[PDB]
Design a protein around this ligand. Structure first.
Ligand SMILES: Nc1ncnc2c1ncn2[C@@H]1O[C@H](COP(=O)(O)OP(=O)(O)NP(=O)(O)O)[C@@H](O)[C@H]1O
Ligand SMILES: Nc1ncnc2c1ncn2[C@@H]1O[C@H](COP(=O)(O)OP(=O)(O)NP(=O)(O)O)[C@@H](O)[C@H]1O
Ligand SMILES: [Mg+2]
Ligand SMILES: [Mg+2]
Lengths: 527, 75, 527
């Protein structure tokens, strides 16, 4: 059984649902925003300042108020997926657009024309933001963006700035929970994977459980090694060279492995055998990456080269390999620069499509493995409750730092939307109702700065008026520093946020709020 | 407690001042400091203190061994 | 369906939840603290004085009050995991920080700045505690620490002091329930495991049921022995030496075992065979630990030596072994006294990284087996109900004794926190709200001493004033002895607790309590 409600009754339900969701999220906005404790059915409650985390939990008993809440939750969800930051700003913007749109509709405006006017205004606002955008000069902007996104935490900003330099432009940064109270940065350069150490007898550094080979030969072969007859020819010729030998396969069984280890103990060869990483389809690409990095080729099942007939011609080579209990690293063969570049070009071309289908984001890691490096930031705290909140802030700053490199940086503290909203004064349209939609965006763009002031104990309208006039007297980058409560140049002070975050937040907020305003009836099941 | 101080803390210090300073030393509640009560003029008739404890113990003892209460049913 | 509460209403719920949990735990604090009986659904109720045990059982009907209770339970849980003692002190500290933080916030202070001020104060307090820390000189402090942590039980302190000496600096102590009413200490030196006595006919002393062998040869072979054709060649050469032979194998069955027992009865050899300890990978390392201690080499499938091809060259040796119905003990390998130090270093280097992996002392047991010994304290009482509480106290004193060796000892009775809080008077910060956070820690650090006095029937504020003034008139170590009710030197009186416990308690209490103070809204499901 369904019930349908119409007109002002329908919009009243939607407004109540949107307001109750937005009121919970908006308390976390700004440098003086406060956190929200979320009940978890099993275990410790979650304390968080993250906007999308709070929004994802909200749900209401009233079927019609819930519909309003669930629509605005999409604003925070989409912003997190695309930018990873600005979810609270997007939620604040969505409420402002919806609330002002209802006032215009209540005056008799056409709901569809308001949406058309809103779309035109957002196109102008996004263009203005890109004009204010400044490309990241280097470490100074990176450390400033990380500090601001981490809720003004210079310790986190320093670590992320170091991580960006270590892995470079094409590297990847991963955030994990440390097992101790300290927060550490761990960087590894070159190829590595989660396999190795088929037997303890390959020890070369007993003080560290490390198997170390210098200028080793790398054997990339798919299937098992299960007998001496085929393993001997590969061993029969590496002895002549005298260089160390490394074996990568799915496994080496007892009859096969006992040959090398009894040979390794006597020192006729210095070698080690490791299992090939991955499963199923995901095998060949890694070994192909490993083979192309080593300057040799991968012995492939499709290739048909019998293990007996192999030689030193296609045997791979590296400079240094380190093997431990569960990990092996290859420094690099520094070969095939153009060939790997094609895979780098292709993988990123595949990423933009495979990101909607892959099981894990490790496809990006495949790019970084043969072209850059990976950095692991292990967040640590005295307790689990503090660690969860600290780790979330680090993830937000990592995402914001990545977004800043792509599209530059913009004045923070909500100044960018205030500056962009000024151009809407010159945007005139012939339709009266579409003009109301433009006016809605102008008021909405100036809402985040007022909420930041309100959270810090200042009047939003007083702060907004000063910031508007300071744009003419001092410059476009001047704003309000809610941390200490005075006006200054935001870009010089380091209060900046990425252009991508600001652009995505206004676009997502307008798309949902504009769609909701066109509604006239709500259909929901009777409880 | 009525004046805004912890009762047991005040009592403990008044007990200490009974041998550090003298028997008449106590706590002034008008101004929150300890002083000699007799010199300060904070004195009571000894009949009041004597009768109060005697009267209070008499009614309390009566109610401690009361075994029955007889009263009319309120309609 | 969620409901969100804000501001003072939210903090009122949290304070009620924290207070109700803390009130139950705090009755167990001090030498005159009393115990709590916890209902168990099936069986006898548990009587305990353990702070974390009481905290773990607390749960409330109100979802918002339960949120406060579950967060503070993390303070007691983390303290038990890290130090094993001081869980009641940590819970008392957490309530004091949270209660005073709410008062500051109600006056208009910024919650985020209070947390920053709290963090600075804890850093200073922890530094001061390490200044007061005195290293453990020997048995005197070990007995004093064990006695205090066992609730002033001298008999328990004596036993633990003996156990520490027996196993040495690198041994391990295990607490178990005795089958009788007496409490006993049992110490074994050297390697031992839970296998042995494949056949009852291997008897050297029929009075005691064991198979003592003098200077035996130890045969470390991984797989099964199941034929005469391979056992006999190894038997062909042990007879020449005339020394006894010990077999460690996967399983000796009828056909293989019948050879020795018939031969053992005839007296041509004196030998015994035992089960190999462990399963899976836990097999591999154990015989490797046995092989290195005995001076021989383990005959693994990996090594490549067949059973009949073995000889005296790699056969292990020992001075004397004891094998009984369920235990085999090797008392001395007479070799590799230099190699094990490298092995020892390799082990704890793995131990610290595998602290995330292990859930049983087997990680340290293997290290303790070869480098030291193990001591089993079997707690006994006339009744299961009394035994449960007595065993808990013994475990607390064992953990405290271990923690005292690591980081030294500090004056007890809450004096250390009082002395450390004195340095907070000199700590000034530029932000007014951060100063309130420092003042919160100063009051919190002085709460445990007041609660100990309150549990003993004395006034906490009166005791605190005297202890503060005695710090300069007499010395820093002077405090209040709540057991008898007079002031004295705590270090001379033996009222001391480990530095690690005091440091861990304040750090865990501040991390959780500081995090909760930044909360503004609570999201919980409607019941
Ligand atoms: N010191 C400051 N003074 C003024 N504005 C600031 C300051 N620090 C940060 N901001 C601004 O405050 C906003 C950041 O607050 P934050 O709580 O991260 O909002 P969000 O990014 O929209 N949500 P989340 O997904 O939770 O990070 C941005 O607009 C910053 O530019
Ligand atoms: N005789 C004593 N006089 C004064 N203080 C004492 C005395 N004995 C112990 N204490 C102190 O009281 C505290 C020990 O009480 P206890 O009940 O063990 O607290 P906890 O260790 O925080 N909780 P738990 O995990 O249950 O042991 C420490 O601060 C001791 O220094
Ligand atoms: Mg952010
Ligand atoms: Mg204790």
């Amino acid at each position: 059984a369904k019930k349908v409600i119409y007109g002002e009754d329908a919009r009243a339900r939607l407004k109540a649902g949107v307001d109750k969701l937005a009121n919970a999220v908006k308390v976390t906005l700004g440098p003086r925003g406060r956190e929200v404790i979320i009940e978890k059915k099993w275990g410790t409650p979650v304390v968080t300042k993250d906007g999308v985390t709070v929004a994802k939990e909200i749900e209401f008993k009233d079927p019609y108020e819930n519909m309003g809440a669930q629509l605005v939750k999409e604003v925070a969800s989409k912003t997190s997926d695309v930018a990873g930051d600005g979810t609270t700003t997007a939620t604040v913007l969505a409420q402002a657009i919806f609330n002002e749109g209802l006032r215009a509709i209540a005056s008799g405006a056409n709901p569809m024309d308001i949406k058309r006017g809103i779309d035109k205004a957002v196109e102008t606002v996004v263009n203005e933001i890109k004009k204010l955008s400044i490309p990241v000069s280097g470490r100074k902007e990176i450390e400033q963006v990380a500090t601001i996104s981490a809720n003004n935490d210079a310790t986190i900003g320093k670590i992320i700035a170091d991580a960006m330099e270590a892995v470079g432009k094409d590297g990847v940064i991963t955030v994990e929970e440390s097992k101790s109270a300290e927060t550490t940065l761990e960087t590894v350069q070159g190829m590595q994977f989660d396999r190795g150490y088929l037997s303890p007898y390959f020890v070369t550094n007993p003080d560290k459980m490390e198997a170390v080979l210098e200028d080793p030969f790398i054997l990339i072969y798919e299937k098992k090694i299960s007998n001496v007859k085929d393993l001997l020819p590969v061993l029969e010729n590496v002895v002549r060279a005298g260089k160390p030998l490394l074996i990568i396969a799915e496994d080496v069984e007892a009859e096969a492995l006992a040959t090398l280890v009894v040979n390794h103990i006597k020192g006729v060869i210095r070698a080690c055998a490791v299992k090939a990483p991955g499963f199923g389809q995901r095998r060949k690409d890694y070994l192909q990456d490993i083979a192309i990095l080593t300057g040799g080729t991968a012995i492939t099942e499709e290739l048909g080269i019998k293990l007996e007939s192999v030689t030193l011609d296609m045997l791979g080579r590296a400079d240094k390999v380190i093997v431990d209990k569960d990990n092996t690293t290859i420094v690099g063969g520094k070969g095939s620069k153009e060939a790997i570049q094609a895979r780098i070009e292709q993988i990123k071309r595949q990423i933009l499509e495979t990101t909607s289908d892959y099981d894990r984001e490790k496809l990006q890691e495949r790019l970084a493995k043969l072209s850059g490096g990976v950095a692991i930031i292990r967040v640590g705290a005295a307790t689990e409750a503090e660690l969860k909140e600290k780790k979330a802030r680090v993830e937000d700053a990592v995402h914001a730092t990545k977004a800043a490199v792509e599209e530059g940086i913009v004045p923070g503290g909500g100044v960018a939307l205030v500056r962009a909203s000024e151009a809407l004064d010159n945007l005139k349209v012939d339709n009266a109702d579409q003009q109301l939609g433009i006016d809605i965006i102008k008021k909405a763009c100036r809402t985040p700065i007022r909420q930041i002031a309100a959270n810090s104990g200042f009047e939003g309208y007083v702060v907004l008026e000063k910031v508007l006039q300071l744009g003419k007297e001092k410059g476009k980058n001047w704003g309000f520093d809610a941390g200490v409560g005075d006006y200054k140049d935001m870009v010089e002070a380091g209060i900046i946020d990425p252009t991508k975050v600001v652009r995505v937040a206004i676009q997502n907020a307008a798309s949902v709020a504009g769609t909701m305003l066109t509604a006239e009836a709500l259909v929901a099941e009777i409880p | 407690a009525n004046s805004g101080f912890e009762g047991y803390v005040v009592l403990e210090k008044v007990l200490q001042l009974g041998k550090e300073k003298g028997k008449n030393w106590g706590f002034d509640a008008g101004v929150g400091d300890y002083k000699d009560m007799v010199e300060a003029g904070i004195i009571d008739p000894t009949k009041v203190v004597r009768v109060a404890i005697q009267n209070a113990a008499s009614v309390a003892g009566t109610m401690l061994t009361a075994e029955a209460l007889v009263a009319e049913i309120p309609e």
